Amino acid sequence: LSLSAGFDWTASILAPESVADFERLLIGNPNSSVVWMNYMAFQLQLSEIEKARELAERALKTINFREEAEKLNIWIAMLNLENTFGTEETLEEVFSRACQYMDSYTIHTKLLGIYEISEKFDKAAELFKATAKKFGGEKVSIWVSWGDFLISHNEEQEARTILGNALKALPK
Amino acid sequence: TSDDYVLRIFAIAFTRKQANQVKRHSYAQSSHIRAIRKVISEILTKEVQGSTLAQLTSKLIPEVINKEIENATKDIFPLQNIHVRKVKLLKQPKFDVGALMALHGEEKGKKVT
Amino acid sequence: EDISAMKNGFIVVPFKLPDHKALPASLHFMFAKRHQSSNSNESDCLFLVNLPLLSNIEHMKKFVGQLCGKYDTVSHVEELLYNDEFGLHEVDLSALTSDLMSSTPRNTALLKFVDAASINNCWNALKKYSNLHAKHPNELFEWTYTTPSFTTFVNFYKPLDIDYLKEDIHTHMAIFEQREAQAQEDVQSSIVDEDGFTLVVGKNTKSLNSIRKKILNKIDKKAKKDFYRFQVRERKKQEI
Amino acid sequence: SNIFKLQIDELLEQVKLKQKHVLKVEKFLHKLYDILQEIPDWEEKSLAEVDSFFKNKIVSVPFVDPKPIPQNTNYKFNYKKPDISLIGSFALKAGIYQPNGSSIDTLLTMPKELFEKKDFLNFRCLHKRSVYLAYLTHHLLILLKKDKLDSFLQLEYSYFDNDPLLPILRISCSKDYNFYKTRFSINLLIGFPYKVFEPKKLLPNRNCIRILPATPLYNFSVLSSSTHENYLKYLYKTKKQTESFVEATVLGRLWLQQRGFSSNMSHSGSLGGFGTFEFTILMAALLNGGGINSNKILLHGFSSYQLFKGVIKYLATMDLCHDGHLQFHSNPASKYIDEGFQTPTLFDKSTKVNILTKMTVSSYQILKEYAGETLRMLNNVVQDQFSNIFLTNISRFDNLKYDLCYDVQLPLGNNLETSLAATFGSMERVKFITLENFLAHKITNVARYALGDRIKYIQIEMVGQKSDFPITKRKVYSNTGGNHFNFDFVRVKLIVNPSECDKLVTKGPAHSETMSTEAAVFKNFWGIKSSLRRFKDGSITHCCVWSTSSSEPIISSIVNFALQKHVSKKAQISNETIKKFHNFLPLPNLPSSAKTSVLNLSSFFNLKKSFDDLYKIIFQMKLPLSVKSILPVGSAFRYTSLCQPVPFAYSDPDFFQDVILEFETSPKWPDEITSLEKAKTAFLLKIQEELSANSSTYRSFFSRDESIPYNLEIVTLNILTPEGYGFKFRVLTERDEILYLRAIANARNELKPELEATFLKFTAKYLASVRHTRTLENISHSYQFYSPVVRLFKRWLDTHLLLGHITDELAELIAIKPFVDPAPYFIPGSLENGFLKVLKFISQWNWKDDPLILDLVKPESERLTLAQYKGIQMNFTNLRNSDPNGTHLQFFVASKNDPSGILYSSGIPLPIATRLTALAKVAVNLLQTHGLNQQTINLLFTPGLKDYDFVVDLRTPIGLKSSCGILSAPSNFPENLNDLSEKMDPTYQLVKYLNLKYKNSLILSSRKYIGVNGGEKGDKNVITGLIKPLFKGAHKFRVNLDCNVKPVDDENVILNKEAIFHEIAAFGNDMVINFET
């Protein structure tokens, strides 16, 4: 005969609805942003913003560095998290950090969307100006999206001024 | 040392004049002498702690330590006759025959009849 | 087997596997999509996924040759870009530590062609190749897996040629002397900006890249509480 | 201290007995007392009359051997109502909850009129006692039947404290008066009145069995039988005086149980004799004095810890057996006498009773060791020791508790051989009442003398000794005994002394003109094997010379001959378990390999001597930069290589040994890394070049090393020493470290975790490695057995395909803890004791929540201080905060060398880490289920291999065992050094290379040392793989799947097992033979 021991990949030898269940899922699903995000939301639904913040920090490191798309889910999730439940400063800290790790212009675009969804038009306009300043000379989409924002809010004259600025900044 | 040999070391060096020197003397003002003694203290401490007594004497024979001193002190001021003058062994640990045998690299007797 | 192409647009590319005594019609599939990029070196490339083990260039030279003969198409290949199947070269550490000597997914690589005439020829041929499995699996091609690279790779415990090493070290050194020498002159050459501002460079500084990295990396004690008539007036205020 | 306070209370409440079971028992035995008073009296009877009275009764008198015969039993027998009383811990209300159960001691005092003043002679009183007990049982049973309680009571006889001279009745409840749930047993102790016999006549020196030799044991029993309530009164006063009497007492009780100490007799063989009572009596004796100047040692205001701590100090340092003894007065301050009686003695002048009679000298020595051993733990402030002191049972396994165990099978075992029975004889029945007492002394006395300084402590245990017998029988009946001897066999348990265990010659008395008494006993004890020999010093002494064997220790040989010569020529002594471990260690292919002892490190030193010759050559060589130092950092250089070095045995994976070369500091090192090593390689070219010219007898070549990730240009010089030994040379540069520090700084934040991992291997390989070898080699001298056990430990990992993922250092740091941290056990002194201790730890270790921190120091500076200790402790919490499940890091091994704690334990997959714990848990459970034996061990070193998803068989073209230097062979290096690869095993590189490909999908494992675990020829290796849960199931396809898969739908794929099976097959080429999926 021989020694045979059942394989243990969850360290047991030592839908999700609890703190454990998501962790047991994360044993086999470290690269799934959906599983991480689902355990982001459960903590938030429990009013545990602090335990939610430390979580995505683990998610940012746990996920393989090559899974850029999965990483994008967390960064957008944090932007939604800080925008909804946090303050201006923490959102800025995440926002600056998000641009540091990922394509900055993409991160700018997502926050513009987040502000529009959250109906924070004043901050959306300000971030449009900053995003256009940094990327206006290279990206036509920011000008089109910014023009879409103003036309949606019945600002035709501002759109014309913005289009003029688009021609000045963009290459011929 | 990490084998718990507490020792005291004494290092001696001398000032030297440059190749193009014209001044008769090669005195150094005190703030070198204070910065010299500091780096000498650091290197001597680093070597002894980072070496066993058997390993330590292995460094003494080639006089490597003087050379790191000479390189370490080269920026601050040129020196000469850098030497570890004297080495004392203040305290010893509990004696271990097994370690001693290893450092030196049992026998049955002969019937008397 | 009826599957010919995947919905997002990666086409199936089946292969017959070698016969080995240990393992007595098992197949290997690669997945390919036309790669589009404005970058010149990435232009005219075919994106490829799930490559066989140690799939360097001359493998595809056989397969493209097999496809060319079967489908009477003219297709030719320069090189397989981004073939890092071990993930050995993903970080260019030489570039990371310094700028001198280096100005600079997984299980996939980019297959470059000679011209647009070749890639479309192959891409059309590769479709007809894909449809083969549904009808005639036997006529599929077989992945040889053997090309002179594997003998070098399989021979792990091969000493390096000392003569080759000596020449290489000399060449890499000598170029380094030229580059470092040029850098040290550049920093200590009295750089002055167009508006008459003279850069400050310290002694023993070797690289301007060193200077910029330092910049990125990086009154109250002298103030007195009690000197001015206003100050003691504040003190007189708090005293009572 | 306050932490210890609260921990003590938690232990107290946890073991506190539930008061309901108390009230349950007083309901019963109070009624039992009513039953006793119903028992009628009796008239004077002779032995003939009582025999007839008991002839037909089911009950039989438990008469003690020698049973009374009609001639010598002239004294009559009578029964009268005794004085019912309750004694023991329950009397003092100091009991605790015991899952196995506790006992309630009820004392029955015999009316004084039932005795004569001279009834303490020739067992006169004890025979009177035996019939009295029988008469009680006869009447108690019928009354028990009358009251209907017999349905759930079972009655049997037993010996108090395993004392054959003191039979007693035990009452237990089987499944309103039913007290089965209470887990208690009422013990009916038949004691004598106080002062029936003159205690002066019952002193240990005096005799009371006519045949003159003294009778300490028999004197103890009768006098102790007459002194029970007196001590109860003595304890009761002290309990009132000091508030914490009970709390200290239970602490002593709990400690005694964990160390397997009991009040039961020790001359009978079992470790014990010291129980709660003796601990309480000593503590009481310390609570009325104790010092040489009769000064107080414990104060009534002390807390439980102070009372417990003082006692542990008291026993640990003062000797009560050989030099010094204590006297106290139960009824006067206790004073420590310098004189000793050569036996553990606690004299009581008030009662003239030595409480330590039941202690054996051998047991006392071990007991003193434990007290001192715990005391250093008690004084410890850096680490908490509460659990180890109180919450760890070391008596579960004898092998873990004893270095060597020998089972001796006595001949003719339905009575012992006539010669053996003859040895017992008249003088010893008076001295040792029972042969099992006498024989145990005989085994101990010969064993202790023969072994002498080779051992520290010795324990003789008679396995299978019973103490309870049915009422229908007079004495205990053993299956092999046949009422003659109450044991199955005797086991000799030893605590060996590593320093002198393997001495080839046992030194003896020096020669003289007239043979001294010591010389005479030396010659007589050893007989023929005694010899007088001269040594190189010129001394002449009587000594006997042994032969070392790689398969057994000298301790085996000595005990066989000594026991056989003196005990019985027919005795069979066998310890196969140690033999098998010895065999599993690889036998080197060196001269006289078999005759070497496993403590011989001879092969290892030869490697250094060859290195030293090479060392000198390098230094005298002239290079542009002077050599700062050459540091060897190899496994062999730290005496941990699994297989001993062998000349020219280059098939061994560890044959090539690493060494660090450091030059003098210079500012001309290249500032770009890729130049830096190419500058380093340039130096090696000089070393290879000039070495070749000046020293042609040394051969050399270069190799490609990729251990450091992404540093693909570090080139190492391989030197083949003419002695037949190989070394790998690699240059360290002070700029190298900061360049890596440069890399992490400017690296992109996402990439920074990757680079620091590269730096982690860099420091692990160059910087920390030097410190690791330096500390380990020094400590290894003190820990003689550490070097082989870590090798065997590594051997065990290899069989289960675990070394490939476990770095050798981590195994070494794992294997050493029983040595640096033996608590609660002792330092391992046997290969068996050490290895199982390593496995025992790993099974019970909670890596998820418990860190591992080692003081790599010699036995009692560099000890971890409180500041450093906490400093490491926060590190574990911070890491576990980020990694609670422990996925990224598993084993947290830290020390002075590694304060980070992550150096040698990073990169190991979780499945592997759980296996390491899983395998140990199965291992210990197997040991518990089945005792250590040839079958169980052969299981411990065989791999199951079934659980793996797919298993691949590989075979090498030639047998590599001989070229590995393993004796079931090359004598020079090949002329063409390319030929070396022809005699190597590539699989360990194959699996590593295959692991990196399929990291996201597969975990492959293989046996690193094919020569050791590759069969007889050492040519078979196996590659075992493991699929993650994710790619086991089908997945929607994606670019970032990063795996070889087979489509099933137009957006679904599954793992391609078969192609993977092909690729490994061609990758092994002719090596692969078979697959198993």
Swiss-Prot record, chain A:
Localization per record: Nucleus, Nucleolus
Domain of life: Eukaryota
HAT repeat positions: 15-45, 119-152
Subunit note: Interacts with snoRNA U3. Interacts with MPP10. Component of the ribosomal small subunit (SSU) processome composed of at least 40 protein subunits and snoRNA U3.
Function text: Involved in the biogenesis of rRNA. Required for the formation of 18S and 5.8S rRNA.
Other comments on record: Present with 8860 molecules/cell in log phase SD medium.
Protein name per UniProt: rRNA biogenesis protein RRP5
Organism: Saccharomyces cerevisiae (strain ATCC 204508 / S288c)
Swiss-Prot record, chain B:
Protein's cellular compartments: Cytoplasm
Molecular function per GO: structural constituent of ribosome
Keywords (A to Z) from UniProt: Acetylation, Cytoplasm, Isopeptide bond, Phosphoprotein, Ribonucleoprotein, Ribosomal protein, Ubl conjugation
Primary localization: cytoplasm
Source organism superkingdom: Eukaryota
Protein's name according to its UniProt entry: Small ribosomal subunit protein eS1A
PTM sites of type Phosphothreonine: T113
Assigned protein family: Belongs to the eukaryotic ribosomal protein eS1 family.
Note: Present with 92400 molecules/cell in log phase SD medium. There are 2 genes for eS1 in yeast.
GO biological process: cytoplasmic translation; maturation of SSU-rRNA from tricistronic rRNA transcript (SSU-rRNA, 5.8S rRNA, LSU-rRNA)
Subunit structure: Component of the small ribosomal subunit (SSU). Mature yeast ribosomes consist of a small (40S) and a large (60S) subunit. The 40S small subunit contains 1 molecule of ribosomal RNA (18S rRNA) and 33 different proteins (encoded by 57 genes). The large 60S subunit contains 3 rRNA molecules (25S, 5.8S and 5S rRNA) and 46 different proteins (encoded by 81 genes). eS1 interacts directly with uS11 and eS26, which form part of the mRNA exit tunnel.
GO cellular component: 90S preribosome; cytosol; cytosolic small ribosomal subunit
Bilayer-crossing regions: none
Post-translational modification: N-terminally acetylated by acetyltransferase NatA.
UniProtKB/Swiss-Prot annotation, chain C:
Gene3D superfamilies for the chain: 6.10.250.1770, 6.10.250.2760
InterPro entries cross-referenced by the UniProt entry: RRM_Rrp7, RRP7, RRP7_C
Keyword Lipid biosynthesis attributed: no
Biological process, per Gene Ontology: maturation of SSU-rRNA; nucleolar large rRNA transcription by RNA polymerase I; regulation of ribosomal protein gene transcription by RNA polymerase II; ribosomal small subunit assembly; rRNA processing
CDD domains: dRRM_Rrp7p (cd12293)
Top-level taxon in the UniProt lineage: Eukaryota
Major localization listed first in the record, in broad terms: nucleus
GO molecular function: rRNA binding
CC per GO annotation: CURI complex; nucleolus; nucleoplasm; nucleus; small-subunit processome; UTP-C complex
UniProt keyword terms in alphabetical order: Nucleus, Ribosome biogenesis, rRNA processing
Compartments (UniProt record): Nucleus, Nucleolus
Family membership noted in the UniProt record: Belongs to the RRP7 family.
Function description: Plays an important role in the synthesis of 18S rRNA but is not required for the 5.8S and 25S pathway. Is necessary for the cleavage at site A2. Is required for efficient association of RPS27 with the pre-ribosomal particle.
UniProt subunit comment: Component of the 90S pre-ribosomal particle.
Miscellaneous comment: Present with 2610 molecules/cell in log phase SD medium.
This protein's name: Ribosomal RNA-processing protein 7
Organism: Saccharomyces cerevisiae (strain ATCC 204508 / S288c)
Swiss-Prot record, chain D:
Coiled coil: none
Keyword Nucleus: yes
One protein family per Pfam: Nrap
Chief place of localization: nucleus
GO molecular function, one term: RNA binding
Keyword Membrane applies: no
Alphabetical UniProt keywords: Nucleus, Phosphoprotein, Ribonucleoprotein, Ribosome biogenesis, RNA-binding, rRNA processing
One CC-aspect GO term: nucleolus
GO biological process: one example: ribosomal small subunit assembly
Compartment(s): Nucleus, Nucleolus
Its biological purpose: Involved in nucleolar processing of pre-18S ribosomal RNA and ribosome assembly.
Note, other: Present with 3260 molecules/cell in log phase SD medium.
Subunit structure, as described in the record: Interacts with snoRNA U3. Interacts with MPP10. Component of the ribosomal small subunit (SSU) processome composed of at least 40 protein subunits and snoRNA U3. Interacts with UBP10.
Similarity comment text for this entry: Belongs to the NRAP family.
Protein name, as recorded: U3 small nucleolar RNA-associated protein 22
Organism: Saccharomyces cerevisiae (strain ATCC 204508 / S288c) (Baker's yeast)
Higher taxonomy: Eukaryota, Fungi, Dikarya, Ascomycota, Saccharomycotina
Chain's gene name: UTP22
